[PDB]
């Protein structure tokens, strides 16, 4: 269910450039303190989409508080700024497939697709 998650865990969204010109971008959706979705967009490359469970080995293992993301001015973004790019890159089908195959850890994002 979406509201019970919502009403207990703040959903927070971040984007930062990769270190060395055009930069690649690292996007994240934190479901409370722990990452739920990760998206990596490099110039002239296909997107990398990552969801908790299936892609744990490629995803941030730190608690949000530990990352320093909340203390980097300009890193935090609107939910919709993440969502629009996630959806444009095929993130809905990606997560849905992960759910279907029983590879996705239940998060706010999967609750969003339970609709």
């Amino acid at each position: 269910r979406q509201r019970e998650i919502e009403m207990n865990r703040q959903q927070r969204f971040f984007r930062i450039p990769f270190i060395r010109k055009k930069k690649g971008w690292w996007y994240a959706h934190f479901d409370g303190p722990w990452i739920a979705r990760q998206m990596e967009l490099h110039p002239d490359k296909p997107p990398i989409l990552l969801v908790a469970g299936k892609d744990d080995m490629e995803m941030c293992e730190l608690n949000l508080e530990e990352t320093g993301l909340t203390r980097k001015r300009g890193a935090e973004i609107l939910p919709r700024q993440f969502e629009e790019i996630w959806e444009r890159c095929g993130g809905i089908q990606y997560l849905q497939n992960a759910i279907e195959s029983r590879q996705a850890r239940p998060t706010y994002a999967t609750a969003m697709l339970q609709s």
Binding site: P46, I48, E58, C60, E61, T67
Partner: peptide
């Protein structure tokens, strides 16, 4: 403690490398 933010930095650097195996859109 900012060892953890160092850790986040190292993490980002390895992720940044994870795309060099991907094909270019241009060719």
């Amino acid at each position: 403690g900012v060892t953890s933010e160092g850790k986040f930095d190292k993490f980002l650097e390895e992720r940044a490398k994870a795309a060099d195996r991907l094909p270019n859109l241009s060719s």
